[PDB]
Homo-oligomer: 390 residues x 4
Amino acid sequence: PSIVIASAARTAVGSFNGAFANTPAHELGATVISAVLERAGVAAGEVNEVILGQVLPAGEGQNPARQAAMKAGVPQEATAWGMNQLCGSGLRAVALGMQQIATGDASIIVAGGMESMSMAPHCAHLRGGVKMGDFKMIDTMIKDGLTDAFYGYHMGTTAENVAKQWQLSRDEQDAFAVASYNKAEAAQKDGRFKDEIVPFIVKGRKGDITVDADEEIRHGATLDSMAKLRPAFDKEGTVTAGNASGLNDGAAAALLMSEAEASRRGIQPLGRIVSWATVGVDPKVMGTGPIPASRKALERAGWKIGDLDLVEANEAFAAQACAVNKDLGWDPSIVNVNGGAIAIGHPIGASGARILNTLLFEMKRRGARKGLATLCIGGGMGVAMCIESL
Amino acid sequence: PSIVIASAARTAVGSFNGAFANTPAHELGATVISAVLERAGVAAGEVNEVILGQVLPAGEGQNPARQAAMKAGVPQEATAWGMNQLCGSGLRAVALGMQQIATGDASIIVAGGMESMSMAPHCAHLRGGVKMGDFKMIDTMIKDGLTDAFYGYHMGTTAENVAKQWQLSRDEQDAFAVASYNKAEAAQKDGRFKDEIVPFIVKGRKGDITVDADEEIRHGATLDSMAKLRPAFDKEGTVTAGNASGLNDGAAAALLMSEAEASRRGIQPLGRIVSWATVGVDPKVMGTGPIPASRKALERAGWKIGDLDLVEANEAFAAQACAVNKDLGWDPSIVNVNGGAIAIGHPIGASGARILNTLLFEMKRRGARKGLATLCIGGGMGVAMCIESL
Amino acid sequence: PSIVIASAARTAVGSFNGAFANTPAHELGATVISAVLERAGVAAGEVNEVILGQVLPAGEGQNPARQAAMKAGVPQEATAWGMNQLCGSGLRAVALGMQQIATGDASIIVAGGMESMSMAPHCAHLRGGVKMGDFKMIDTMIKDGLTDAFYGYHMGTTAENVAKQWQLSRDEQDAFAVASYNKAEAAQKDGRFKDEIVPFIVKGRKGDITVDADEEIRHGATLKLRPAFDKEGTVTAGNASGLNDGAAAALLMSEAEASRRGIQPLGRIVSWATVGVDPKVMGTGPIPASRKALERAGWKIGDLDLVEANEAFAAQACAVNKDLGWDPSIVNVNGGAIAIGHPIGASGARILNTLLFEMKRRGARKGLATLCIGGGMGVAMCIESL
Amino acid sequence: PSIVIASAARTAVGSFNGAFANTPAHELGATVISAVLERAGVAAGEVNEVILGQVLPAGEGQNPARQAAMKAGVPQEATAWGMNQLCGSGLRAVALGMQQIATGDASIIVAGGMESMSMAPHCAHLRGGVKMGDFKMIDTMIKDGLTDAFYGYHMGTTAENVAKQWQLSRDEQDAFAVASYNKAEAAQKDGRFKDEIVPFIVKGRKGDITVDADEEIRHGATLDSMAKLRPAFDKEGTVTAGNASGLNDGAAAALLMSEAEASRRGIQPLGRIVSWATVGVDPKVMGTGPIPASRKALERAGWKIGDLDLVEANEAFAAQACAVNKDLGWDPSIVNVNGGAIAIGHPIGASGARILNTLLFEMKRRGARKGLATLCIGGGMGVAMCIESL
Ligand SMILES: CC(C)(COP(=O)(O)OP(=O)(O)OC[C@H]1O[C@@H](n2cnc3c(N)ncnc32)[C@H](O)[C@@H]1OP(=O)(O)O)[C@@H](O)C(=O)NCCC(=O)NCCS
Ligand SMILES: CC(C)(COP(=O)(O)OP(=O)(O)OC[C@H]1O[C@@H](n2cnc3c(N)ncnc32)[C@H](O)[C@@H]1OP(=O)(O)O)[C@@H](O)C(=O)NCCC(=O)NCCS
Ligand SMILES: CC(C)(COP(=O)(O)OP(=O)(O)OC[C@H]1O[C@@H](n2cnc3c(N)ncnc32)[C@H](O)[C@@H]1OP(=O)(O)O)[C@@H](O)C(=O)NCCC(=O)NCCS
Ligand SMILES: CC(C)(COP(=O)(O)OP(=O)(O)OC[C@H]1O[C@@H](n2cnc3c(N)ncnc32)[C@H](O)[C@@H]1OP(=O)(O)O)[C@@H](O)C(=O)NCCC(=O)NCCS
Ligand SMILES: [Rb+]
Ligand SMILES: [Rb+]
Ligand SMILES: [Rb+]
Ligand SMILES: [Rb+]
């Protein structure tokens, strides 16, 4: 059976300790679940299961995916669960929801991801007791999200490894980053993010605040201020806070059903999932994950790289993003036409579904037929998905 | 395509802060991954993906499922990810791994679960700063594992709700718990756990320690000491520490492949996955999850309840376990013939695959044809899987 | 032997998480120690001992009094130690330094107090291990500084007991606070705090900042705030002292020693006293302590020309004034802790500086300083001009 | 006026996380306060002030000295306060209480020290907020008690500096420690600690426990077992866990009054405080503190070193104790005749009064006329007091 994406929605991507500084992840997820239901004309009582990727759920309670579905109005008869493949979680959950319908075990799936890096707590194992001496309170965002478990350094250090191998200069990475800011600022000014974004109401005591714009997009990002920044990981390196994605909060999801099911409801799907793939790479060069993952997804779809009309390649770092574009060789003018994670933000568990939303709504906006979304994953992995319009 | 379980293995279930008090979950997972590979004659270089359920991964680093695969020797080209459906995670990962082969996106999967509740840390959100006054260090095991997010009380309170609706006396729950201990002690004395258990070597500085026996199994559990215990949740209730499953550590997994693949390798599979199902219920009575989940799994398999030769129903609490048996009405003599989680232990993220091991190895020793494994899930959910012998 | 205060100095009182938000207490203390030494023309090598009161030293390292003396330049030959009598520590340390010279065990003492409530950490006992369940990270500032150990409620609740027993209305307590703000705001405009205050340089990365003015003084305090302790009480954030940082000290020596060095002392310690009261009604401590100090000095209440009574709460300050009956026009003529601030370990020496420098500015002969202490205690000291 | 010690008492010195593992310091102090009142026949209503040294009071509430006095029965009219001169606090509080009566501001003083190093908490400044990254939970016992504030290393490192200056071999320091253990073990067997020790009732839930014996006293400390221990501070040093004092809990105090007051009450004082002194030294060699302090104290008393009949020199480290004995040149057979802090323990805030108790009761037991007690203080200080029997 062919699985189509009947509808999709995402929240604005908030800055670290910014708009969503005190908003739990499942509250963002519930808003996205309700949005994809309204946009498709599907009631909450029809959803069979909710699959939400999430990397940092510590302290949010039992199964935040279940919390997001219940708050969105999904009945207790349905099920919900979370999964963690780091940065590719938001997109892998869509593939997993697609398989639930392919194997005949479900009919309607809400799949996506949600992440609140601001709400990540500090933790320490204290059951055995600290008999004597100091101990460390560990930042779960750094430890469980952004630090390689095999070599011990940050994900920006792996980007330094890619930067050294593909011989990408500091100027080339800054030029890529500046281009990402300008494309995102132009798209936001033209309102090209309005369709995918569902407004989120930050319920406050002093007054409610409606967040409907990605607050990481900077206006007037100059190349001179980008080249004045010091390297953020290697003191004699090339990756800085400017040419790297930041820490962000947000949620995104899609409504999944069979093509025949959408046809029975008179729904015009955003696209048809034709293939997907996930491949592992060396954890040292985790940013190269999209390279074998995209080729495997295109091979499963029977497509050549030139067949793609639009591409969404997540920009974890400027060094890894340039390497993926150079290795695969696709036309850069069709890759991230509205900017990328360097300017929009990188909410780990939701970025996979975030770029899926951006990919789906731009394919609809310009009539693209074949699209591809891909991300790199910490620990040395990549995930890719091919979408075709109906 | 038909998916069979080529092999399975589990660690001994360790007591809270006991043998595995300082052992990370992925170290337990790595031992199980290597075991199912040896027991099936499959090399680590052949594994496509590792899917491990885990509820409490805080503080263990990026994607502990990837850490278990790397330590077990699975190459970097493969992928790995974790997922969280609370107590049903260990069994749901097996269903998810089966779907990876059903949809043709993988050939060999190592699926299961791992959990180290002893290593669960205390956490607190400290980014905004505690300007004044005391604040709470939250136990992630209680918050993220054992507390309902909608009503705020422990899972033992939900067992009180089931006990009240089904009119289950304290004596009936104690009689069930004592029966669970006696069956487990007899099985352990007869060596019926020897095949499924792979020994785990607790690497210590003052000598290594080999753990190969479930250390929660009590020898000579009397009814008088069970009826003298005070209620552990409601001070005028019926659920106690004796008639309820404890806090435990452990890991379990299974190797999945198509029936044609296993036949090509001369493997005699432990069983064939014929169906699976997951259903949601009211979070107040989350212990009733196995009732609609088992009925849906049997309906998808085309089986009647009487067709089952062996049943493994997880004993989260004596009150919920008695209600599932009374409602479904299957012969209690074929349900948990070697005891259950009340005596063996309940490592949440791994219990789903744990009872699958007990089901698979008991089906083989007594020649059972049709089996079923099922668990209840916090938040009001259940999961069930039907297995048929080859 | 007669003990005189050869010189005195204090830092500006900083607001909670304000100017001294990241300044350790001993760094403020070191500046005060060096100040009282320069103002008297006495070298650091002549100081025998440094006695500094401090209530919240957790996390600052071994003996912060030793750290303050060494950083100020006091040589290793001298000794240093801290003491804790809560809000009376700053003044009790001066009496203790007076006894060191009276008993012939020392010649020159630098005594005072220092407190950094902003730098107070959160703590929890974790050696035995938390096997299961949540535990509390305890605010040491509240627990060890502002919470009664016998009845478990905040110090603002104890002020409600005093307010209820003495029948002090909300308007009467607020009127006292407004009068305290007006006297303090007026004194800072007239520059009457400039002599006693020694500037402190907050060493910063993006540039140094010199703090020389009490930043808690409110401009335009008008006569709406909700009660901060009792849901139906009278003590509010306005009629109560806040949380602050600061340090203050004095230089001690015999009167014959000061004459041999050509020093003109700010005053002479003639007597001192400390008495305890019921912890339920703390804040009445200055009443028996001042009477005992005046009795030891051979003075009547009318003999006092100037009085410094610490204003922990508006309710406790009114009770002390009503019971003792001294002229309110000579009590806290430049404001009090309600407007200036309340650095616990340093408040005792803070009002001593204000008392000494105002007696000198208007030629007062006899003065008295007194404070209330948590747990039901009071401390008082009588000062006479030369 | 002449100030005499009318009575004295101390608790047993408990091991780190041992008998007094969960006993607050003021509870140990209250027992000692009540003891010195009963042993002298003085009512609590006559005590003017209570002066208790304490180094680690974090988390115990407002003024633990006030808490100890109130719980002991001292009325609210009296006053109480604590002081901190590190390891010399217990003895300095006695000198401070002596000055209160000498200056005519008090008549009866209870002075001493109390310390619960087991109850010391871990702390961290969290008001400004930890925006990102790990932070350290600081052990207040190590930071505020055992770490030099000017050079940053432990007090055992300062003992290494003293050992190098006086050229003290590992064998000489171990031989000193062995002699300290043998003297303490013999005294405890002979009951020479019975008079000074007041039993403490550890109020427990499963039953009360009476602690009346120093639990650090080791039986049969040999030089062969002492030479197998590794150095505890310097990897190529000489100070080990065996030849150094440990971490302990305990309390001790003495009742102070004028000599004429004791005569009016028919009280026979344990001794008369004739002089005291405190001098500072280089913090690098803080162990030499007792040398100028004892010489200054003897000079103030008009005594020669040979006039002393009994000496109590606190054994912070075996290296520091040997240097003090060599410099002063007094007969080693009269120094710590019942053992020292190496075997008995070192409760920081109470050690000053602890060794004072041992000196007073041994001077009474053998009829010694002139005695001296001295300790070294972190940060480079020493304190000494001369006692004469009546
Ligand atoms: C790169 C990173 C360390 C930066 O966070 P940071 O250390 O707190 O540094 P900041 O974000 O506060 O920015 C630092 C400075 O650069 C400036 N700056 C940042 N981005 C800029 C830009 N795009 N243009 C111009 N100036 C910029 C900021 O204003 C700031 O100025 P300041 O020094 O006066 O404070 C953090 O965002 C990060 O870890 N990113 C990696 C995320 C990741 O690994 N995701 C997974 C990938 S698979
Ligand atoms: C029930 C629970 C609260 C117990 O907490 P606990 O107090 O730490 O349990 P403990 O065994 O450590 O202490 C219980 C007491 O009863 C006794 N006891 C326990 N089991 C006993 C038995 N089977 N027979 C006789 N006595 C027993 C213990 O020895 C102890 O007495 P003690 O103080 O002398 O040691 C905890 O195990 C729990 O939360 N279980 C929930 C599991 C769960 O929610 N699973 C998921 C559901 S979907
Ligand atoms: C003030 C205190 C009571 C806590 O109150 P808080 O609300 O938690 O913190 P603050 O009151 O300082 O915050 C300032 C607020 O007061 C208001 N406020 C206080 N005094 C005011 C005044 N005199 N005029 C106008 N506004 C005033 C400010 O506008 C501000 O409003 P906000 O609540 O919206 O922020 C705190 O200072 C305290 O605990 N003091 C105890 C004193 C003590 O124990 N001393 C020891 C000796 S016994
Ligand atoms: C020295 C110090 C670090 C101890 O290190 P420690 O390892 O934590 O002490 P421990 O008892 O836990 O370990 C000591 C080991 O040696 C053994 N040991 C100790 N003393 C021994 C002795 N006297 N004879 C034989 N064996 C001995 C212990 O049994 C233990 O064996 P283990 O390996 O099973 O633990 C600590 O006691 C210390 O810091 N002391 C200084 C206190 C201080 O500074 N006071 C201030 C004075 S100014
Ligand atoms: Rb950026
Ligand atoms: Rb049990
Ligand atoms: Rb105020
Ligand atoms: Rb020792």
